[PDB]
Amino acid sequence: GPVPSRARVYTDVNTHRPSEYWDYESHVVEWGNQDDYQLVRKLGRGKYSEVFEAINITNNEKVVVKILKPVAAAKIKREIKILENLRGGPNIITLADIVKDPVSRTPALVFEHVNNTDFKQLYQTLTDYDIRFYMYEILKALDYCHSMGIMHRDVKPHNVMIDHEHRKLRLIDWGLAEFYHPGQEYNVRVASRYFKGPELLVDYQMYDYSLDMWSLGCMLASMIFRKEPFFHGHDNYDQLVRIAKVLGTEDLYDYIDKYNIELDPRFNDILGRHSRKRWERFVHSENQHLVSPEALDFLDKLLRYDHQSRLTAREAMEHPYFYTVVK
Numbered sequence: 001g002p003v004p005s006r007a008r009v010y011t012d013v014n015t016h017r018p019s020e021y022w023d024y025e026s027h028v029v030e031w032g033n034q035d036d037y038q039l040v041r042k043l044g045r046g047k048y049s050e051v052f053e054a055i056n057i058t059n060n061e062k063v064v065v066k067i068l069k070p071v072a073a074a075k076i077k078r079e080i081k082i083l084e085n086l087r088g089g090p091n092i093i094t095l096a097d098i099v100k101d102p103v104s105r106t107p108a109l110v111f112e113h114v115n116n117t118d119f120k121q122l123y124q125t126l127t128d129y130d131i132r133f134y135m136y137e138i139l140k141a142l143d144y145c146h147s148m149g150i151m152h153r154d155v156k157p158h159n160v161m162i163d164h165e166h167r168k169l170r171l172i173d174w175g176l177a178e179f180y181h182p183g184q185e186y187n188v189r190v191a192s193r194y195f196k197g198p199e200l201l202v203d204y205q206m207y208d209y210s211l212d213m214w215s216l217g218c219m220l221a222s223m224i225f226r227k228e229p230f231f232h233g234h235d236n237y238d239q240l241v242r243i244a245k246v247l248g249t250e251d252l253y254d255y256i257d258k259y260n261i262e263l264d265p266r267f268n269d270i271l272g273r274h275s276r277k278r279w280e281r282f283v284h285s286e287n288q289h290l291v292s293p294e295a296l297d298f299l300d301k302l303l304r305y306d307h308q309s310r311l312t313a314r315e316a317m318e319h320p321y322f323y324t325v326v327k
């Protein structure tokens with residue numbers, strides 16, 4: 001069967017912390033006062049929650065209230081425990097409170113409010129300098145949560161808020177986040193399609209923190225090449241084909257061979273044969289201002305089939321791409 005895998009970094013974090021740290025079921029939630037928060041307007045609704053802008057009436061400050069749908073308690077406790085563990089970490093969204101919603105009778109997570117810049121606006125106007133600056137801010141959040149034994153598993157543009165005025169970044173939506181435990185087989189149904197790593201697409205369950213570095217690479221490639229999304233699959237199968245047309249099929253076959261993966265036979269008729277395309281093939285007059293040899297070198301080291309061969313967040317921070325960023 002498949003050969004096991006473990007992260008090359010932060011492998012022991014959850015064993016050397018007490019059991020209370022990662023055993024989210026045993027966690028007893030301290031409940032705040034729901035009347036401290038007055039709902040202002042509905043911001044959105046996902047599959048697991050309804051999101052409201054609100055005012056904390058005890059200090060008159062804006063908050064965001066995420067009222068959870070009554071799906072599965074295990075998921076709820078995991079998100080709370082991860083948010084509390086990472087609280088105060090660099091560029092991690094602050095969980096300000098947990099209350100019982102009077103209407104839904106379900107938990108409602110209260111977060112710090114981010115006056116975020118419109119995402120289409122960020123995509124269309126961040127400069128070469130800003131992409132480097134904000135990518136460095138994302139790496140601070142990722143290295144922190146990975147160092148804390150947690151993988152985000154849903155890194156994508158909508159989960160990375162920026163208040164451009166105050167050059168402030170927050171990594172949000174920790175509902176798919178998980179504790180990394182060596183040898184553990186995880187659900188591959190995580191991350192949005194365009195951001196799914198090859199490990200998920202080939203159904204390799206023993207993945208780790210390095211999944212977040214692939215997703216980050218997808219964000220970077222889209223930004224610098226001006227192609228949204230960069231890997232545009234019609235479904236999860238075609239998603240692997242889109243990747244293969246860029247990275248080639250030979251390295252995909254080596255990856256599968258290395259981990260002794262049994263590739264879904266559905267792939268035999270659609271993968272075809274492709275050779276890696278040099279990154280310069282994606283350069284054109286409309287994206288030349290965001291591309292540099294350092295940007296290409298950095299992207300190359302994130303977008304690798306082999307999850308074990310990708311730069312970690314800490315190594316990524318040492319890359320020449322960030323030398324121009326004021327620290």
Ligand SMILES: Nc1ncnc2c1ncn2[C@@H]1O[C@H](COP(=O)(O)OP(=O)(O)OP(=O)(O)O)[C@@H](O)[C@H]1O
Nearest residue numbers: 043044045046051064111112113114115158159172
């Ligand atoms: N802490 C926060 N501060 C301000 N706005 C927030 C905060 N957390 C979430 N929001 C906003 O709440 C809205 C609704 O959240 P939701 O997750 O449903 O949206 P989304 O990111 O567009 O969804 P999807 O994950 O499908 O892309 C979004 O506009 C999101 O930016």
